[PDB]
Design a protein around this ligand. Sequence first.
Ligand SMILES: Cc1cc2nc3c(=O)[nH]c(=O)nc-3n(C[C@H](O)[C@H](O)[C@H](O)COP(=O)(O)OP(=O)(O)OC[C@H]3O[C@@H](n4cnc5c(N)ncnc54)[C@H](O)[C@@H]3O)c2cc1C
Ligand SMILES: Cc1cc2nc3c(=O)[nH]c(=O)nc-3n(C[C@H](O)[C@H](O)[C@H](O)COP(=O)(O)OP(=O)(O)OC[C@H]3O[C@@H](n4cnc5c(N)ncnc54)[C@H](O)[C@@H]3O)c2cc1C
Ligand SMILES: Cc1cc2nc3c(=O)[nH]c(=O)nc-3n(C[C@H](O)[C@H](O)[C@H](O)COP(=O)(O)OP(=O)(O)OC[C@H]3O[C@@H](n4cnc5c(N)ncnc54)[C@H](O)[C@@H]3O)c2cc1C
Ligand SMILES: Cc1ncc(C[n+]2csc(CCOP(=O)(O)OP(=O)(O)O)c2C)c(N)n1
Ligand SMILES: Cc1ncc(C[n+]2csc(CCOP(=O)(O)OP(=O)(O)O)c2C)c(N)n1
Ligand SMILES: Cc1ncc(C[n+]2csc(CCOP(=O)(O)OP(=O)(O)O)c2C)c(N)n1
Ligand SMILES: O=C1CCCCC1=O
Ligand SMILES: O=C1CCCCC1=O
Ligand SMILES: O=C1CCCCC1=O
Ligand SMILES: [Mg+2]
Ligand SMILES: [Mg+2]
Ligand SMILES: [Mg+2]
Lengths: 587, 587, 587
Amino acid sequence: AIKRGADLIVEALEEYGTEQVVGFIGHTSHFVADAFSKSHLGKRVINPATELGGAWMVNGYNYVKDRSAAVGAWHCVGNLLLHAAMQEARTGRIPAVHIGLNSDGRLAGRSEAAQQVPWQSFTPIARSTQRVERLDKVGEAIHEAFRVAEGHPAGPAYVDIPFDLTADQIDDKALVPRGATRAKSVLHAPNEDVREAAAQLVAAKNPVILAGGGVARSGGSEALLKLAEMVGVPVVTTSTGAGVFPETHALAMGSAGFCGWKSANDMMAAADFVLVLGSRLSDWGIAQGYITKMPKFVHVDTDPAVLGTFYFPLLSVVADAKTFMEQLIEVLPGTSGFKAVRYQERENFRQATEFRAAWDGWVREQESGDGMPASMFRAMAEVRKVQRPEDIIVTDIGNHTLPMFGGAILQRPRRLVTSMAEGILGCGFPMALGAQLAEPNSRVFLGTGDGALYYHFNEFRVAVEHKLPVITMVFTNESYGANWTLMNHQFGQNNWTEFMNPDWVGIAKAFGAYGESVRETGDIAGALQRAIDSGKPALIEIPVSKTQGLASDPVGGVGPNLLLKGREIPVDTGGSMYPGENLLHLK
Amino acid sequence: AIKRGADLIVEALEEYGTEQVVGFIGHTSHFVADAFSKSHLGKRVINPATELGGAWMVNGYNYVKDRSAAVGAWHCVGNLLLHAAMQEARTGRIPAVHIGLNSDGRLAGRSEAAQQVPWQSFTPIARSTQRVERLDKVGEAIHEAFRVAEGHPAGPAYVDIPFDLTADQIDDKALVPRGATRAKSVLHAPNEDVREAAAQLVAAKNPVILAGGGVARSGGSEALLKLAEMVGVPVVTTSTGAGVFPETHALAMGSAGFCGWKSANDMMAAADFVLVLGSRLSDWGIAQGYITKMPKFVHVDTDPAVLGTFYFPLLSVVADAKTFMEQLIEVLPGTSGFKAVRYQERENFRQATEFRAAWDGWVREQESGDGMPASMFRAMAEVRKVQRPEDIIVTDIGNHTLPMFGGAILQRPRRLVTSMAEGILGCGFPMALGAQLAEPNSRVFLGTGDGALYYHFNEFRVAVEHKLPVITMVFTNESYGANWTLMNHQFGQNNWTEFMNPDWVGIAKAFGAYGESVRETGDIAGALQRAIDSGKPALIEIPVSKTQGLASDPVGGVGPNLLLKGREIPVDTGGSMYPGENLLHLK
Amino acid sequence: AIKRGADLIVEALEEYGTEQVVGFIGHTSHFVADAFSKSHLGKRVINPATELGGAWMVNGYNYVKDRSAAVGAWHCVGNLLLHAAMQEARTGRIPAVHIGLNSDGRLAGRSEAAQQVPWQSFTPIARSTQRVERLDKVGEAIHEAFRVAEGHPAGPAYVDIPFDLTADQIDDKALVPRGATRAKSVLHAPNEDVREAAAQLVAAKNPVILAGGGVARSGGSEALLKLAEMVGVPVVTTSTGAGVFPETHALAMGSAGFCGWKSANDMMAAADFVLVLGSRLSDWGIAQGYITKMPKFVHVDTDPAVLGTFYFPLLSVVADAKTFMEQLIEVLPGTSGFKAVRYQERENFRQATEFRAAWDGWVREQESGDGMPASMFRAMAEVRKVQRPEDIIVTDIGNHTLPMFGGAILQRPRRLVTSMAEGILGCGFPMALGAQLAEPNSRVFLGTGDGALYYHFNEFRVAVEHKLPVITMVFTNESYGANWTLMNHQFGQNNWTEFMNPDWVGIAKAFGAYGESVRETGDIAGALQRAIDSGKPALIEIPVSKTQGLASDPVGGVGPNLLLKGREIPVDTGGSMYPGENLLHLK
Ligand SMILES: Cc1cc2nc3c(=O)[nH]c(=O)nc-3n(C[C@H](O)[C@H](O)[C@H](O)COP(=O)(O)OP(=O)(O)OC[C@H]3O[C@@H](n4cnc5c(N)ncnc54)[C@H](O)[C@@H]3O)c2cc1C
Ligand SMILES: Cc1cc2nc3c(=O)[nH]c(=O)nc-3n(C[C@H](O)[C@H](O)[C@H](O)COP(=O)(O)OP(=O)(O)OC[C@H]3O[C@@H](n4cnc5c(N)ncnc54)[C@H](O)[C@@H]3O)c2cc1C
Ligand SMILES: Cc1cc2nc3c(=O)[nH]c(=O)nc-3n(C[C@H](O)[C@H](O)[C@H](O)COP(=O)(O)OP(=O)(O)OC[C@H]3O[C@@H](n4cnc5c(N)ncnc54)[C@H](O)[C@@H]3O)c2cc1C
Ligand SMILES: Cc1ncc(C[n+]2csc(CCOP(=O)(O)OP(=O)(O)O)c2C)c(N)n1
Ligand SMILES: Cc1ncc(C[n+]2csc(CCOP(=O)(O)OP(=O)(O)O)c2C)c(N)n1
Ligand SMILES: Cc1ncc(C[n+]2csc(CCOP(=O)(O)OP(=O)(O)O)c2C)c(N)n1
Ligand SMILES: O=C1CCCCC1=O
Ligand SMILES: O=C1CCCCC1=O
Ligand SMILES: O=C1CCCCC1=O
Ligand SMILES: [Mg+2]
Ligand SMILES: [Mg+2]
Ligand SMILES: [Mg+2]
């Protein structure tokens, strides 16, 4: 049957499981928009204020879904705004398919052409970059994009299609690949490796299980709870893993790292052995700038590239995290040295509970006071009083990241959202809107700095039109507070850190969102109640200090090395000159 | 003297004539910001709301200056936002040096590293992309960047410097190249070429001189006025050339092209010969999607790559525009057939004045009218009543582009600003702020769509803090009106075009800008005067139609081919299968 | 008319002035080879032993022609051999169009595909890299390739065409661009610049004119002779400029640089002013590893990118070399201080003739001597006894390069050929075959090392079949003699330098070439005469020392810095670890 390339694009997207389209209009996307209007995808298309805001929504949506359920579809030069969000998806393991409609292929390669997008700029970023030359390759290329995006490692795939192909027509027989079943990802470990890991766990004086975001992707929460209680071993997470183990449990230390919980950092410093499940041991994660000293450890991942790249394990194992834990549960009764007793009765339990109690005491101290400015730990204590197990916490990047991570106490996977891998400022608001689109009946709370909110608050258009009831706290300090604080330490003076805020309540009201400031009241509790009652996107202005959080608060970190010390470098005396030095030799 | 890398960067920027920095803080830019605070250039730093907004400011500043007088300096991941603005600077011939401070060079190449920016993503976009490996190359790299950016063709240069080199120190002897060197750009043509062009001009029955942006870069206004009057020849411009010839002159036909003046398109259709000076005959300029039929023509440019790429001239000449005109003026008295006659008495004068009169009458009709929705030609007529010769007109991309081009009547060069080469939505507001920074004796009037203003209105923080009294007219239609209109022509139905606006007056007020709506009053003249009187950046909300301008108004255009018709494409019958087709051959 | 893509390719190559094809068969080049067999150009096809050998032939042919008169046409995977020759054409300013026929476009992008050539591997090398997507772009792409290749700077252009488009057919109306267009390259300087250069030249006590390869491209020999005699100024060349000034003239100092004439290096050290015409002042040319100290200088080039990149001139001028000289000759009589005097009576004449005499005496000593091992200066003295003014001297890269440059005494341009820009071993033999194809009225003498001849002596198949009577002297030392010598200077010990030779006379005989060894006879003069008399390609085996030439002979050089001295580098003490260091902190 004769079909337009635009219709075939829509058909392929539907075949591979697309639920949500984020699209931007222009003459190159006209046929695609027309085709979507005839599909069940048409109704709920999001047309964002900008393409980078929309690309952040795709990342929030897909981070919580663990598949490319949201897709981008972009008119030519709007694809030039994608790179920042695309880079986060790469290193942050977010599946995400982007379809770029380029200008007419007849005009490609002409030196004075307009809007001929340099798709080769994505080659260093996307996990897959494809330029489609021929109409009969459109289905094929979209099939490949999903294959790469939803693999191990997950990441972004970009497909560039000159838009004349979207207008052209062809017979459709077999053109969209249909009917594939993917390989299972329940990879089992060798029995000997399971037994060696069991033997280490039972021999250790102060063991730890370290669960990263792979445990969430694997669906391993039930197995982790059973394992940790059976061996009686404290659980530490990464920031992407937080919530895979209930953080109200006596064994829960929280997340290790420089914006994490001191209980977790104390536990990692005390440990003699670690079982690492589904973590890449990253720079701004466990490695803390490659300064952290790992105890002896077993490392279990589905991606061999992460195993042994920097930290050399005692044993590296290619396996699924859930599956590995189930294998371990089966072998432990027959492991020499294993004793089946309640976790509360183990010798290692007191030290772990002490670390947690000391952390919890510090956090309670940070929640105290009723000043202006307010404490961001106090703001999070108020969120917790109105927070359900399914609800999602979002943050942006800055001093505020630390109190958001420290005040988040989670019970389910994928409830903590940000630009985890890259720390790209401005992510938080649009990622929160994407997460809300993915889970319409979950409540989404965002804690954002003022410098951060400046980026994409234009997306209040989408929030108000689509009635996305995200509750946003904007922490105001008239500064890039992390940099204010760090530069004062480093040089004795800050520069480039200060700015004027708008009347944020006035901004919210100008869009038709709920707005309220607690500057004169301190009534964070009441503001959250009123925001929730509104049924609208909401903005609550909360004044904070320039110093609280990332750049100041003692959580047991060792890195990263942000305030590096320069070295004196020798000149080159081999005889070659600098450019222009010729003039200095003239007599 | 022992100096930090950061200090050497600042010294190099000052040496090569930097006047204005647009810079964004983060730990990788800390040493550079500290260095700037100790220097003359430190007094002129804009900290923008976002890096893309700031990169658009660099483009507006440098478009009007024709050199890289503004420079960008960005913390690592913020560089990921630059690509859209950088692509405009490339094809639009805007000099622009961007300094990206990457993360620690020690951490480069590690797969789980944070904030290691893929500088190779700029290779297909910048005219020069350099990754600096060594401290003793920092001055050399910056020198090279300016040389490439300020060449023929002009464009963007990106320099990636790992930030450890900014903290490191070295003896500075000869390290920053001083005393640089620059050839004149007054390239002279051979006498043969001059004589042939003069003979063609004199022999023509209906000649035209076509003046592009190269006449502006050349400084050729005085020579062009003398040559046009001496031979008695109508003048047509490109959109970047508008204003090099006084647009109130009897011989001024205005700009050719699809958003241009119908007098210019009429004259181009009537002409038997064209002398083209400083134009690249581009897709969305004179070529109109490569549909325009050029008369026999002589083509004169400083860049040989533009000569003969698509339109084959009678004669191609490598020469400076001002210089070539001066050579022609000297040769005309001894050219066969030449006689000195007043231009008003030449046989071709009446035809040209008739074309201009017809256009002027149509413009008067488009201004004719009071009430709401307002005509954008009426808005421009009101601007002209309060416009000085050095004032600058800025537009964004959309239906509104055509009335902004058509209602701009200019008397000096470089007074008309937009994303001319690439048509990138949202350029207008930040390019206007950049232009105002560069040209503090110019009043800057921006006519922007609502869909466009949505992108970078966050930059009202810069406009208010730096007291930049740009007068912005936001034309409201609650639509991407160009696409509503094109899609209605193409399909009889629009999709992805409609959206809500905030209360734009409320937005302005929340930033401390002047705000006023004429929705109820129709009082455009009063709103302009009150906006001028305030001394502040101003936002005037003006309701308009969905359809007026680019996608509807007949100005004599022939292209581009935005609404292309699909072709039926044969399948491949070679024998090879589609992916997944194997399952269809099982029985 | 309906035409195959293959036919349209041939038509385009003929239109843009192709004279010679170097082509390699495979199924992807079948249609193109069939098309060539039906065309005028089909009569001039070389099928080389390998694609790299053939690409070197294209370089030799086009170096001497200064246009892309030879073109490559290659079956898919054979394109993978081009990169070395392509890189020489880029930095050495050799025009060269290469047409790669890729595998079926239907199969592109499949991960398990065969012979899908990564054309993106050429992007960092060619001046233009184009992948053609559509049959109706084949003529356009070829047109663009010639425009880039034959520009300023000249260089290589690569066009990748999937071979299905060569079999496909289309109506040909307007598809191959005809009537192309080309601006003159006689760029004139402004009068100010001409007058200043003349005043500097006249005021100097010890001037020099430095003439590079741009004087050859310009055709400026006649003007240079007149200018040098009129002002009475010694002439120095680059290695690509040698022969633009008659090297038997009293004012001829020869070529400066590390493999040049000591008379030229002496004169450059004595000079108070230099006028540089058509030179890029390159690393292994005049810069000598960026160590050379230039006197105050005026720098004149057609390519602004060479002016002021490293050596900062007193004055930079964009102009054609021949033209600028002609302008100078016209201005000199009215320049203050100028007087017409015979050059032999100027006060600077004696110094220059003394330099040349000292060099000539040293060369005579180096020729002094009979017996074995032979002096390579003696071999060149024997060539000169049988050398015509249009004959061509070719060399490879090694110790032997210096005596080939030093014993070549030339009277016309473009008579000295090698991999000048990149020093790529094995260039000599195939570049000599290319040069012979281009210049059938030239006798071509190649002086090659043994290590070099090893690369492409397989091309004796081409030399014999096409009756190309190149006279090759193979200098035998059973070593990479430059590296034996440099390593002995550097370490007191060589490594990886020594090897066996075949019986080279036997090799020649096995191909049907003339072969003779002088190992027993010393009879170089007789061997040259017998080789000429045969009418065949010839190989003369001449034993030589391991050490004579580049790495040993004192010619007044100061660089480059090939034998650099290491520096002690501080470690990083920031706190971060090496990969695997974790295991060292466990106790
Ligand atoms: C300002 C700032 C502060 C931060 N502070 C911290 C902090 O204090 N602590 C912290 O942890 N992070 C912090 N981060 C986040 C950090 O940068 C990383 O994003 C994070 O630590 C990576 O988590 P992960 O190692 O679990 O790997 P992820 O990035 O979540 O990747 C998942 C891993 O699991 C594997 N995997 C996937 N599926 C499976 C499966 N089925 N079975 C087995 N393996 C699987 C993958 O191959 C990969 O190795 C911070 C970031 C910012 C911007
Ligand atoms: C929505 C939209 C609508 C548009 N409508 C129109 C329209 O109607 N008409 C129109 O013209 N454009 C229009 N444009 C702009 C268009 O896309 C191009 O940006 C513009 O036409 C290019 O102008 P130009 O040819 O003068 O070259 P520029 O881009 O200005 O480049 C300068 C040229 O002059 C040469 N040059 C520089 N210095 C010298 C010198 N000293 N001497 C000689 N030569 C020199 C350069 O090498 C180059 O060729 C539109 C753009 C958009 C986005
Ligand atoms: C082992 C080895 C040893 C070598 N030894 C030496 C040595 O001793 N001395 C030496 O000189 N080189 C030597 N070379 C060669 C050297 O590396 C360079 O290839 C050479 O010096 C470059 O010559 P050039 O500066 O004349 O520029 P070219 O590479 O010849 O480039 C031509 C220049 O002229 C300009 N030009 C072109 N047309 C015109 C025109 N119409 N008008 C004006 N300008 C024009 C171009 O833009 C360019 O700047 C050696 C190479 C090797 C491999
Ligand atoms: C795109 C981008 N620009 C800049 C930065 C550097 N950066 C990281 S956190 C931060 C401060 C953010 O300020 P704000 O949102 O107000 O939070 P606070 O530090 O005040 O809590 C900055 C400037 C970045 N990571 N990404
Ligand atoms: C980044 C980007 N996204 C999208 C577009 C496509 N586009 C061009 S003009 C236009 C309409 C803009 O709407 P508005 O600013 O309201 O102007 P109007 O057409 O209503 O005058 C759009 C969507 C583009 N060129 N660049
Ligand atoms: C492809 C390549 N490989 C290696 C070299 C390094 N190289 C340059 S000169 C030289 C010696 C060549 O030996 P030969 O041809 O025998 O000349 P000789 O030095 O003995 O005169 C070598 C190995 C190079 N420049 N290019
Ligand atoms: O989508 C469009 C419509 C025409 C002008 C520009 C553009 O991007
Ligand atoms: O980009 C960042 C992130 C957190 C530390 C400070 C900074 O500038
Ligand atoms: O040219 C060919 C023919 C088929 C085998 C391989 C190849 O390259
Ligand atoms: Mg803040
Ligand atoms: Mg609009
Ligand atoms: Mg040898």
